[PDB]
Coordinates of C-alpha atoms and ligand atoms in Angstrom, one line a residue:
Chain A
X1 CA -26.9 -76.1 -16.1
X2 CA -24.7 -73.5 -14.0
X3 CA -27.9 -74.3 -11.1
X4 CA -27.3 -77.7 -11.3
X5 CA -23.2 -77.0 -11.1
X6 CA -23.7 -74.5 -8.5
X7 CA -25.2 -77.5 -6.6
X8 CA -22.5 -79.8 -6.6
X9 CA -19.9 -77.8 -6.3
X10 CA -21.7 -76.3 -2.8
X11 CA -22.6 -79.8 -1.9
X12 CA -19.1 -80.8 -2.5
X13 CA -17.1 -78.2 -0.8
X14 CA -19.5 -78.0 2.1
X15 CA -18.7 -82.1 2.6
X16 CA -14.8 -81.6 2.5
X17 CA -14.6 -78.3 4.8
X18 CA -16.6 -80.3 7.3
X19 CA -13.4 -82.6 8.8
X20 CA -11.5 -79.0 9.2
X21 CA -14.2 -77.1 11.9
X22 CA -14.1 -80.5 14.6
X23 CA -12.0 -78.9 17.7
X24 CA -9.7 -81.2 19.1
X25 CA -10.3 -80.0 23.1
X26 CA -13.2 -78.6 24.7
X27 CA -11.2 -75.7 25.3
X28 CA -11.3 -74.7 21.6
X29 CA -14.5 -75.6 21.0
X30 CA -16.0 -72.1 20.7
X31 CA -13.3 -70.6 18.1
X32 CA -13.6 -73.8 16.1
X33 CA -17.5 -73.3 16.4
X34 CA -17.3 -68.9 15.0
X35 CA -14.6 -70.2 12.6
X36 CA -17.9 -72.9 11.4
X37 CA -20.4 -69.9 11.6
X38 CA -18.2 -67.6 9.9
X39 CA -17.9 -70.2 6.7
X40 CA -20.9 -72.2 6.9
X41 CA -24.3 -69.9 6.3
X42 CA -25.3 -70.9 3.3
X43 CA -22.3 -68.9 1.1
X44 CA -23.1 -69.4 -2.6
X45 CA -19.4 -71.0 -3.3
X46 CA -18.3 -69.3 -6.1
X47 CA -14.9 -69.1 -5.5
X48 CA -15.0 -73.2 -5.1
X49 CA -17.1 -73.7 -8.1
X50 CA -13.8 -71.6 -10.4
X51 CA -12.0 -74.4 -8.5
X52 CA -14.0 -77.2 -9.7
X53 CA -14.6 -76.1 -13.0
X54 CA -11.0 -75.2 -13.8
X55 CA -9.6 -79.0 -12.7
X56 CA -12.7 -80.5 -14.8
X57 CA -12.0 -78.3 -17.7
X58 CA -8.4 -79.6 -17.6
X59 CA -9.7 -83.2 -17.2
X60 CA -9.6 -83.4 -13.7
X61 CA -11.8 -85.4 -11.4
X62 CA -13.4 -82.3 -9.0
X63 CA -12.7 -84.1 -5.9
X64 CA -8.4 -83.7 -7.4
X65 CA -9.5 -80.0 -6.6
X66 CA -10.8 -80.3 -3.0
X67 CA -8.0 -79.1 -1.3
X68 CA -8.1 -75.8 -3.4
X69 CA -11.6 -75.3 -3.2
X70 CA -11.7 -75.4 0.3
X71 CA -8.1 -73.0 0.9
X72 CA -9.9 -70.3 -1.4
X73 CA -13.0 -71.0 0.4
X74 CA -11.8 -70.2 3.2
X75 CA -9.3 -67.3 2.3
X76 CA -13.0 -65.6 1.0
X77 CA -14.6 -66.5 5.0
X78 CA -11.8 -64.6 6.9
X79 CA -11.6 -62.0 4.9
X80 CA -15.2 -61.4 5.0
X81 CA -15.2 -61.3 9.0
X82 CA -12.3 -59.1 9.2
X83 CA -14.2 -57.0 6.7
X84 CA -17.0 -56.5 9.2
X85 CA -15.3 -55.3 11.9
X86 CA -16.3 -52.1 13.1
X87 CA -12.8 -51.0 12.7
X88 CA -13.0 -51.5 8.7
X89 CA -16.6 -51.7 7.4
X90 CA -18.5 -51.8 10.6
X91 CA -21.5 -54.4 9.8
X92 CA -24.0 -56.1 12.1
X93 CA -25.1 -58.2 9.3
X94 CA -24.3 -60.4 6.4
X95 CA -27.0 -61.6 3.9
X96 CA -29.2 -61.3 6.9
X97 CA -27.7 -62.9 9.5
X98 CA -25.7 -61.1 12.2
X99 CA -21.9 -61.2 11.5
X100 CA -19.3 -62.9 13.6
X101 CA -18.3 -60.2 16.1
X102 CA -22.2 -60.1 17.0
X103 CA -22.7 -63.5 17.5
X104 CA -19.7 -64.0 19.4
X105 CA -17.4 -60.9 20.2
X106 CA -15.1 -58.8 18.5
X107 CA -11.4 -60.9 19.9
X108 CA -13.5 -64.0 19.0
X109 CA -14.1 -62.8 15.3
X110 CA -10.2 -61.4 14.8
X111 CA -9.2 -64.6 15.6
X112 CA -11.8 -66.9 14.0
X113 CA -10.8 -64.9 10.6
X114 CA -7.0 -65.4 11.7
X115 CA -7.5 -69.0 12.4
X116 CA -9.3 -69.5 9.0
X117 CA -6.1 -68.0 6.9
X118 CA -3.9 -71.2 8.3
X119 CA -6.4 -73.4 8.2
X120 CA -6.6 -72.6 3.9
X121 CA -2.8 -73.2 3.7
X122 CA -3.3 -76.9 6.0
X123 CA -6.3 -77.7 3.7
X124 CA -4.6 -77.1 0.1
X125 CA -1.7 -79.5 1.3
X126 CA -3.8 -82.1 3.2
X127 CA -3.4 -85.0 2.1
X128 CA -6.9 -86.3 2.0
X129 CA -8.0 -82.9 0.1
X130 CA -6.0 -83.8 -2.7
X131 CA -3.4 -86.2 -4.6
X132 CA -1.3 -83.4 -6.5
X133 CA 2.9 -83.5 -6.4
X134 CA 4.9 -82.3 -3.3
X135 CA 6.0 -79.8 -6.6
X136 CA 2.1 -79.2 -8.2
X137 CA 1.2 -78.2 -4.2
X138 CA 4.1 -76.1 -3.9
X139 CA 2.8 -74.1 -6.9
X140 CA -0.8 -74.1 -5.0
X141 CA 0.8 -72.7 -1.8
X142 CA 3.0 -69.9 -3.7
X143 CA 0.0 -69.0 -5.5
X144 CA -2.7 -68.6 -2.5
X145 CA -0.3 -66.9 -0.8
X146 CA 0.8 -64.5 -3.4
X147 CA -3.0 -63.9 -4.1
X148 CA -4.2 -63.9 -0.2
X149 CA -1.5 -61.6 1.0
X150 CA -0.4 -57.7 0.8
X151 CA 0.1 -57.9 -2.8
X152 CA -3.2 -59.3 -3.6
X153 CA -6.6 -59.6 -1.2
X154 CA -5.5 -57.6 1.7
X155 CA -3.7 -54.9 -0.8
X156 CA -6.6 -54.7 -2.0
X157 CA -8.3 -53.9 1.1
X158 CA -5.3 -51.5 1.9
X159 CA -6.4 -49.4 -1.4
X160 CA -9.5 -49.5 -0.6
X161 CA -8.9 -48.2 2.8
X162 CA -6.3 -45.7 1.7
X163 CA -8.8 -44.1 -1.1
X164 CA -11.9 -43.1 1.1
X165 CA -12.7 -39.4 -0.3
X166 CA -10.5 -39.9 -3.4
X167 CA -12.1 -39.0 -6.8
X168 CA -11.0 -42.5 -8.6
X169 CA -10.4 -42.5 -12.2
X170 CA -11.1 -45.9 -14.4
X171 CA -7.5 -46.8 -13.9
X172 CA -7.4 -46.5 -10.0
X173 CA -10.7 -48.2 -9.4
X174 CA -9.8 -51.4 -11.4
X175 CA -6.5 -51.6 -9.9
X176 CA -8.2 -51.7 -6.6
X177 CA -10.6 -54.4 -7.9
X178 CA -8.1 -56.2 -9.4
X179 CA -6.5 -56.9 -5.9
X180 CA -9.5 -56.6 -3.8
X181 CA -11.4 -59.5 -5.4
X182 CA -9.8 -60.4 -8.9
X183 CA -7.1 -61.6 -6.8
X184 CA -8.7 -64.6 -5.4
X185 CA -11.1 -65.1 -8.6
X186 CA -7.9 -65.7 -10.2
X187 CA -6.4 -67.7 -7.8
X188 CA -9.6 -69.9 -7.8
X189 CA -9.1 -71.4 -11.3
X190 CA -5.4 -71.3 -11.3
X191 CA -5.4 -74.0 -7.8
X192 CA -8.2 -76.0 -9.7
X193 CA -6.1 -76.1 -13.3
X194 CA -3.4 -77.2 -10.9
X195 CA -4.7 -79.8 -9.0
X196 CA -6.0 -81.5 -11.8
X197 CA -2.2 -82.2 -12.7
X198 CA -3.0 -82.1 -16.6
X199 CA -2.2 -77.7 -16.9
X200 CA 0.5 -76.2 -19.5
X201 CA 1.3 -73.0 -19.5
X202 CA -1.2 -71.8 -22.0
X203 CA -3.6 -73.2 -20.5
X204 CA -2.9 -70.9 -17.1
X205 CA -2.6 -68.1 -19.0
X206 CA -5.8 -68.4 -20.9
X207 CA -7.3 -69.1 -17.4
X208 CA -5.8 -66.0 -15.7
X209 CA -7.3 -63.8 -18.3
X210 CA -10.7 -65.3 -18.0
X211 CA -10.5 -64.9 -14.1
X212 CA -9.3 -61.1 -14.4
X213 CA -12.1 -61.1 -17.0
X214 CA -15.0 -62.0 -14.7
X215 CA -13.6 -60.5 -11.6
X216 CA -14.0 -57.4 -13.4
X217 CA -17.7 -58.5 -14.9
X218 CA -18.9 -58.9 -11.1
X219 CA -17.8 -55.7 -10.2
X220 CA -19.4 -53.7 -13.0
X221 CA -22.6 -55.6 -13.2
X222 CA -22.7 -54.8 -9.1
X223 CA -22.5 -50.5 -9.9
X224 CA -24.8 -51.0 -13.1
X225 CA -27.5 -53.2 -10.7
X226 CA -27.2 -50.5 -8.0
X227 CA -27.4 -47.5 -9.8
X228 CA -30.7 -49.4 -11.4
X229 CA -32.2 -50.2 -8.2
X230 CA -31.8 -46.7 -7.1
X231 CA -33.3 -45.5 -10.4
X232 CA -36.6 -47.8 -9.2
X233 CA -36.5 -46.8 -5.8
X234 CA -35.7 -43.0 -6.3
X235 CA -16.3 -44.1 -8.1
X236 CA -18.6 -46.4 -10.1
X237 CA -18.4 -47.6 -13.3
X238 CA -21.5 -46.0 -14.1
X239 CA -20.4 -42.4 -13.1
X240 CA -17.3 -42.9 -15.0
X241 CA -18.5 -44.4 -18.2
X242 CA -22.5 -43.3 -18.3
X243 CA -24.6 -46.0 -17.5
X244 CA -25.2 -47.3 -21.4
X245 CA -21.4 -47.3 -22.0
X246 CA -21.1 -49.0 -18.3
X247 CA -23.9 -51.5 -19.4
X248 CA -21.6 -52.0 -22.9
X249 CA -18.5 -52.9 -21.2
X250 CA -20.3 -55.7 -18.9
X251 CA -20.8 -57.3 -21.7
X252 CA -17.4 -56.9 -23.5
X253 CA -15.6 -58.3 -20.1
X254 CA -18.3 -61.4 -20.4
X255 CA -17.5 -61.9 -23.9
X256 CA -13.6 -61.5 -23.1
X257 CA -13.6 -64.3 -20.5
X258 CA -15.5 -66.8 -23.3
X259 CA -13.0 -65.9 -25.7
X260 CA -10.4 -66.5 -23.0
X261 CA -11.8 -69.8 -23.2
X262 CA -11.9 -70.7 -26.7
X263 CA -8.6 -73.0 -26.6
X264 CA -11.0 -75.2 -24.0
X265 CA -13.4 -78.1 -25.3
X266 CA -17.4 -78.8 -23.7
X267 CA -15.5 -79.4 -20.6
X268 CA -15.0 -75.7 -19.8
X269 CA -19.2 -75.4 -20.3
X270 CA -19.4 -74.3 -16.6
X271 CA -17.0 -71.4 -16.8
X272 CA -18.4 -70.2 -19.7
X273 CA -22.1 -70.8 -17.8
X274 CA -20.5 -68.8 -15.2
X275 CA -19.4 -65.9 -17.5
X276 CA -23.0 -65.4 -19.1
X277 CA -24.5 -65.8 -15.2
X278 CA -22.6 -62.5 -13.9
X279 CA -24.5 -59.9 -16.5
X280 CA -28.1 -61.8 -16.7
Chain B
X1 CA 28.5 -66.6 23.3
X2 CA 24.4 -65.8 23.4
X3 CA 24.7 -62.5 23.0
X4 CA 27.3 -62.8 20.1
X5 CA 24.7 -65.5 18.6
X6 CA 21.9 -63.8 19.3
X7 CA 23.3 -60.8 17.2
X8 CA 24.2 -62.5 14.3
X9 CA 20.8 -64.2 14.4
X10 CA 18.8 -60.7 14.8
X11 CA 21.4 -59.4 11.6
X12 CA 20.9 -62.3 9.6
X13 CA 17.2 -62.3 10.0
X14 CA 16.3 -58.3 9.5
X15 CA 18.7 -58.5 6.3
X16 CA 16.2 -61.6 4.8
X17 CA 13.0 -59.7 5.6
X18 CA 14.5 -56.8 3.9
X19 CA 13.2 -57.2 0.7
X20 CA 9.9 -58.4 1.8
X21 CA 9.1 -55.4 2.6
X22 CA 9.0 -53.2 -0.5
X23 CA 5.7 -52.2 -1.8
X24 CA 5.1 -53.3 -5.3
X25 CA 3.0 -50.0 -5.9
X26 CA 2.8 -46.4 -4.7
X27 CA -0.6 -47.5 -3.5
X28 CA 0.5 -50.3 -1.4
X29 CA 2.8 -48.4 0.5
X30 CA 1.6 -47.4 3.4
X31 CA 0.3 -51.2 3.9
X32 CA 4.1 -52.4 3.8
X33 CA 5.0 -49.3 5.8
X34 CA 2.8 -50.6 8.4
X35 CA 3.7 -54.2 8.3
X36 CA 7.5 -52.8 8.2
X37 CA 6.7 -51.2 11.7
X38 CA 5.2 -54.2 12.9
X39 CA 8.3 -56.2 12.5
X40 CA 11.2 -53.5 12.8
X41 CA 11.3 -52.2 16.0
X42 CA 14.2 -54.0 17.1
X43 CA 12.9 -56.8 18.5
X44 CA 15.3 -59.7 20.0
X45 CA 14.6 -62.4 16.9
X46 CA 14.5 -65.5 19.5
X47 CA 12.2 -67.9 17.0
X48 CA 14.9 -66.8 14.3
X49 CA 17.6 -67.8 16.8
X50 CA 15.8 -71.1 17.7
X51 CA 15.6 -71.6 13.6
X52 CA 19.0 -70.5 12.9
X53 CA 20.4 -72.5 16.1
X54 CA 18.4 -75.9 15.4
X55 CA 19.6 -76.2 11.5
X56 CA 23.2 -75.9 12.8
X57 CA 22.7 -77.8 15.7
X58 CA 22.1 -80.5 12.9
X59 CA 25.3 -79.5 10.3
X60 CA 23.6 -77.2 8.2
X61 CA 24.5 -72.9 7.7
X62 CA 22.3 -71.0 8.9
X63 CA 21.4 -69.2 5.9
X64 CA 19.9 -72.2 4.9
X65 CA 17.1 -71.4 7.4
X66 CA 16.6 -68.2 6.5
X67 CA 12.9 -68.4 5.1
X68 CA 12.1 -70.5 8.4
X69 CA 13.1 -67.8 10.7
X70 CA 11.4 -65.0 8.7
X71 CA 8.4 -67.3 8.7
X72 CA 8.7 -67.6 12.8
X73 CA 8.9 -63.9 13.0
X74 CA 6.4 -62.8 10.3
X75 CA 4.2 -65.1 12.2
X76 CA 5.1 -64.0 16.0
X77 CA 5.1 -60.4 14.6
X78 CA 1.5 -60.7 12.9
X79 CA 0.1 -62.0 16.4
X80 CA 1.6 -59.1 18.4
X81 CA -0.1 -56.7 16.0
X82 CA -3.7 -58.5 16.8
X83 CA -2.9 -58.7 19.6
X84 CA -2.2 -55.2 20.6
X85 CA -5.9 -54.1 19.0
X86 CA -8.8 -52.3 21.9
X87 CA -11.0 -55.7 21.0
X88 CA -8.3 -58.0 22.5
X89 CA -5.1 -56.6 24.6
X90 CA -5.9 -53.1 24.3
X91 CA -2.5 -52.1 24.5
X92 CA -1.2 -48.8 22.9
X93 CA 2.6 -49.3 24.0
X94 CA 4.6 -51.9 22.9
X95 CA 8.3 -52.0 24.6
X96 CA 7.9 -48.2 24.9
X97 CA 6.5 -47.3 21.3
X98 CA 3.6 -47.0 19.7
X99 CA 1.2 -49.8 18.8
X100 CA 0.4 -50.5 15.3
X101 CA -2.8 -49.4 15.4
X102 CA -1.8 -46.3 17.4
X103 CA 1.0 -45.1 14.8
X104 CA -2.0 -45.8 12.3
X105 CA -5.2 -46.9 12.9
X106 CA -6.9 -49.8 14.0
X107 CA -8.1 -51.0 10.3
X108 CA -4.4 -50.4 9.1
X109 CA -3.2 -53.4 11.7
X110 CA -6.3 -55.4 10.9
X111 CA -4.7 -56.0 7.6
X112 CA -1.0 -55.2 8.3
X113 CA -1.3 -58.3 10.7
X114 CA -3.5 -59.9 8.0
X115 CA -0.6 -59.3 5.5
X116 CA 2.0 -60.7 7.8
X117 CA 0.8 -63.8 8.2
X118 CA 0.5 -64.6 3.8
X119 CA 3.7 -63.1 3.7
X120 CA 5.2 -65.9 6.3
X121 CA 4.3 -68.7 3.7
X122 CA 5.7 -66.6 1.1
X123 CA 8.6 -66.4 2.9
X124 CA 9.1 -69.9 3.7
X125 CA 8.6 -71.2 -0.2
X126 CA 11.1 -68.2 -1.5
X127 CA 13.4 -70.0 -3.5
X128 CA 15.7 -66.7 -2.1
X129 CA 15.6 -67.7 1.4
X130 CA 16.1 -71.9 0.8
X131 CA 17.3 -74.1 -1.5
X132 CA 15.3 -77.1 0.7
X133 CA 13.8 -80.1 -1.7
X134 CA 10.2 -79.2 -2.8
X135 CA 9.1 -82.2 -0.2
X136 CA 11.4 -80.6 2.7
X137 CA 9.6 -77.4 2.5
X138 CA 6.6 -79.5 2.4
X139 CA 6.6 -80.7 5.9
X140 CA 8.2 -77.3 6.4
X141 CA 4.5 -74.9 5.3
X142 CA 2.8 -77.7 7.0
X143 CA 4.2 -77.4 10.5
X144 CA 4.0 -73.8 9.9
X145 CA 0.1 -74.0 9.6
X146 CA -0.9 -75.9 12.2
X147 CA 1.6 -74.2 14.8
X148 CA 0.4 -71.0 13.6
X149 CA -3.6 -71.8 13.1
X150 CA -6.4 -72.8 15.3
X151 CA -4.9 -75.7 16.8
X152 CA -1.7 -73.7 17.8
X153 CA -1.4 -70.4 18.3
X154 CA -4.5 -68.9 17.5
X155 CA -6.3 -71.9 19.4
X156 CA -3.6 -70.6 22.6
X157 CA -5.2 -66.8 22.2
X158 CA -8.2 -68.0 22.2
X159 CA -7.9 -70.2 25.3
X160 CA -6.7 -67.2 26.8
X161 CA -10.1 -65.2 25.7
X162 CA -12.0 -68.1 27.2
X163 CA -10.5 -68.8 30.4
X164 CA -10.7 -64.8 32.1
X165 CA -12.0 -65.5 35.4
X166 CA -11.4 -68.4 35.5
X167 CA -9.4 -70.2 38.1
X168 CA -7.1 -72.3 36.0
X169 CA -4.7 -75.2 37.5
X170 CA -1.4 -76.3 36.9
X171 CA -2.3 -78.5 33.9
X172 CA -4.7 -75.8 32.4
X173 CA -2.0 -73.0 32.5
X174 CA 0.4 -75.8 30.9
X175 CA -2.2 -76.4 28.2
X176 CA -3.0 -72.8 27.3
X177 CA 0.8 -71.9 27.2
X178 CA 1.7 -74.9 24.9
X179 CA -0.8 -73.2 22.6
X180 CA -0.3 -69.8 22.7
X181 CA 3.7 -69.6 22.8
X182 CA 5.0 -73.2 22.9
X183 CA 3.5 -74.1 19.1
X184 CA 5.5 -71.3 17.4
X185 CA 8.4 -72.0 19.3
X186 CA 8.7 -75.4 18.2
X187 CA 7.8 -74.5 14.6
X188 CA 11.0 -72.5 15.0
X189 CA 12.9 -75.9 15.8
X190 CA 11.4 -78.1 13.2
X191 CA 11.5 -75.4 10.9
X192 CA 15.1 -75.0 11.5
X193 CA 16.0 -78.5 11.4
X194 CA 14.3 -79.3 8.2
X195 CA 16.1 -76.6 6.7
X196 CA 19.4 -78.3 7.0
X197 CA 18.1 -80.9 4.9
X198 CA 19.7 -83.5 7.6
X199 CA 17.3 -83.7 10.2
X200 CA 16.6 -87.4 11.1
X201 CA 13.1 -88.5 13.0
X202 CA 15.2 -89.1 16.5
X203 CA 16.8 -85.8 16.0
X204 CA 13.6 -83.8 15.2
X205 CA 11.4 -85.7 18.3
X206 CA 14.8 -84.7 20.7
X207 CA 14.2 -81.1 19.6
X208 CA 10.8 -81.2 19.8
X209 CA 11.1 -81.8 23.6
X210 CA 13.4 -79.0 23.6
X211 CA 11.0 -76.2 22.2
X212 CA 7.9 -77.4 24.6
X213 CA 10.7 -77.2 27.5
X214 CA 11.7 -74.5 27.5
X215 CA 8.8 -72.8 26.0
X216 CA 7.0 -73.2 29.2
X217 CA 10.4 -72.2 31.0
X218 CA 10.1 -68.8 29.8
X219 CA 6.4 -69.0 31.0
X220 CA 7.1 -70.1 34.4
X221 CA 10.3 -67.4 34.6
X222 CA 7.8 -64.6 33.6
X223 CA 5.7 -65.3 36.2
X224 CA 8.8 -65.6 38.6
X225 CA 10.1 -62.4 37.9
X226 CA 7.0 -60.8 37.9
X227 CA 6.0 -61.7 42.3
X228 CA 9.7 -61.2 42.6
X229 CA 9.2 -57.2 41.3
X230 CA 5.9 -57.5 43.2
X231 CA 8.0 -58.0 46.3
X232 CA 10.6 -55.3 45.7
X233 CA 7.9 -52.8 44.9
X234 CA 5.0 -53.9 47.4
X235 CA -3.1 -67.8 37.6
X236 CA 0.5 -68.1 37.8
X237 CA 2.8 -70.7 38.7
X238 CA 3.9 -68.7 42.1
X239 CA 0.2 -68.9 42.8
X240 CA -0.1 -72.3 41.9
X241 CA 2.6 -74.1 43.2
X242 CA 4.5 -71.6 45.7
X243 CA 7.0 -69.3 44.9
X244 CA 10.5 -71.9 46.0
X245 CA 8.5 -74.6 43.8
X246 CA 8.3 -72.7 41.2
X247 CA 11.9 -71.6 40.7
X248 CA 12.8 -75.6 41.5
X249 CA 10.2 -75.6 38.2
X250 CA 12.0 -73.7 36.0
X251 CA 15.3 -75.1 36.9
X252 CA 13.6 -78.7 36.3
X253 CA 12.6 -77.2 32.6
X254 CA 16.0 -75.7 31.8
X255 CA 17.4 -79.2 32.6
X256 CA 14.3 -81.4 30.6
X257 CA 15.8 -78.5 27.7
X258 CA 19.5 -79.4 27.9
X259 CA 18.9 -82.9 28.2
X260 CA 16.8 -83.1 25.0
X261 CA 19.7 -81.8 23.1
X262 CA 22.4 -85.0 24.7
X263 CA 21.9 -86.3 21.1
X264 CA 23.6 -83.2 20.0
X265 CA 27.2 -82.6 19.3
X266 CA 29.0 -79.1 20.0
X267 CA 27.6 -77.3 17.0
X268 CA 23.9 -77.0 18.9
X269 CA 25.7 -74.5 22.0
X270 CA 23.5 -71.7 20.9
X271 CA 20.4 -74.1 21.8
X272 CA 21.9 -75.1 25.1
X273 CA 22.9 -71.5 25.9
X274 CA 19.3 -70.1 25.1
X275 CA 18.1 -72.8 28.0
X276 CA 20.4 -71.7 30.5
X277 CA 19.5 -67.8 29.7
X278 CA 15.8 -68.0 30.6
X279 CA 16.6 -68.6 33.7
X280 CA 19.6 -66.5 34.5
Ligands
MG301 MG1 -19.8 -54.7 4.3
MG302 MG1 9.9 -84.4 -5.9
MG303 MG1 -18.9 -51.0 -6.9
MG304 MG1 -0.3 -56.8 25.8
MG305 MG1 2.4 -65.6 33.3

């Protein structure tokens, strides 16, 4: 079940990202402890799951796709406490607990999150993370960073910054989403396709169009369960399309990514799991 | 000459980081404008110099190490920006022009730095910028990371953040610089030397000893100069040692720097020159 691979894949992540957050010194035992706090609060793993999924659905072993899973991890934790800064989003919270510039301070937090970013390139090439090619890690590296940086994640953020009282069409809002979060999604399964050291390049492809596919999905179904909520209590998809024809296209981007998936045998069960999950 | 070398180095570096800088979208642009200001404003390119310098100290051309010195300076430039921000420095000047976050805003250099520090691992696997063996740039992305991450760099910022008001000694002031400035520095070495695809373990140890040389000589220099314009107007090494101790100290480091490099044949001049600067 996608509970069950949820499970392991947390469990398995959590384990490896462990060895990274020990400080060597004293001296840097408090910005090895906020980078810890800002990674380890119970975070559903997602973004390691894609990674695990994507090596066993190539035939990998999971564990091939450690080193990945923890990078992307990790890539997702820093830009989450840069994100709460109160010079960009400005929250005292996150899933309940208070974010890292409360618990610690706001220097503390800039550099835990700037920390984090080298510690996912060290952890896709450490050795004991992973067992791909000098040449199969190069492609990791080149990837996360293509994803990660200012024409990916943080472009992402930039467009999101840069479009605060702009009327967004369709167009504009799933080019922002594209880079804001599909980025990484994406990323996700092509590091775990890689590490397992078994993917051709229709195999990548197929995978990069599932991962836009569901990046997308999580992004609608988020504007279709708000509006929804503030139905029961009271530029989104729903104010573009109508809700029904919002609630329509969920669906098609689900049934996209399992068609994306169709050259893949049982092996690929948890990312089409996955797919169904997002608009349940 | 330095100042000949050091001109060549700033040319050769500026003209690589060129294209780095283009926004793939209308939508990106101010994002890459932004990074663009954090790295052009003339700066003086020394951890491009020091890459440039140690992969012809060792028979290679220097273009060879171009994606190491953009690396160095996408890096150095990425910290500056941080660095600058009201939460840490709070500075709005930087050698007389605005800071990033004054000539945007403060989110704008969150990410701008953010951006910066992806693109440095972009830089360094850009088959445009090397032609280094898969395994080369390897070691290369690796040295990178952990000069760069929490156990370099970052880890020397956030020593910094922990020790205010506190009375540090000799070997604590030592410890925090290594971090803070001597990591990158001898990243820039390493890098360097890699790059010419000859360096040998000897040779890279030798330079090693080099970087942390006189990467505390510029430290202990700063501090000289600064009691010595104190004096003319009106923890430190001055403070810690005395003022004639301290300039016997940097003397000592110039010469530790120049007797690293007694391994070396003509070719590394530039390295030996830089030493012998600091202190002039
Ligand atoms: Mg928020
Ligand atoms: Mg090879
Ligand atoms: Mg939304
Ligand atoms: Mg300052
Ligand atoms: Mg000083």
């Amino acid at each position: 079940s996608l509970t069950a691979y949820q499970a392991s894949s947390q469990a398995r992540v959590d384990a490896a990202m462990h060895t990274l957050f020990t400080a060597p010194s004293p001296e840097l035992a408090r910005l090895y402890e906020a980078m810890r706090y800002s990674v380890m609060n119970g975070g559903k793993r997602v973004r390691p799951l894609l990674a695990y999924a994507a090596c066993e659905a190539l035939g990998g072993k999971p564990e091939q796709a450690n080193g990945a899973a923890c990078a992307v991890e990790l890539i997702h934790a820093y830009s989450l406490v840069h994100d709460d800064l109160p010079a960009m989003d400005d929250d005292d919270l996150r899933r309940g607990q208070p974010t890292t510039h409360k618990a610690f301070d706001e220097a503390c937090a800039i550099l835990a999150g700037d920390g984090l970013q080298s510690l996912a390139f060290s952890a896709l090439l450490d050795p004991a993370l992973s067992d791909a090619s000098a040449e199969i890690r190069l492609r990791m590296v080149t990837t996360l960073a293509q994803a990660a940086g200012p024409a990916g994640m943080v472009g992402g953020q930039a467009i999101d910054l840069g479009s605060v009282g702009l009327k967004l069409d369709q167009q504009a809002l799933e080019y922002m989403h594209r880079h804001k979060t599909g980025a990484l999604i994406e990323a996700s399964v092509i590091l775990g396709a890689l590490a397992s050291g078994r993917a051709e390049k229709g195999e990548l492809k197929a995978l990069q169009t599932y991962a836009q596919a569901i990046g997308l999905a999580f992004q609608v179904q988020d504007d279709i369960l708000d509006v929804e909520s503030d139905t029961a209590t009271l530029p989104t998809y729903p104010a573009l399309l109508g809700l029904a024809a919002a609630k329509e296209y969920a669906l098609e981007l689900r049934d996209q990514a399992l068609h994306a998936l169709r050259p893949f045998d049982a092996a690929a069960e948890p990312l089409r799991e996955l797919a169904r999950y997002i608009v349940e």
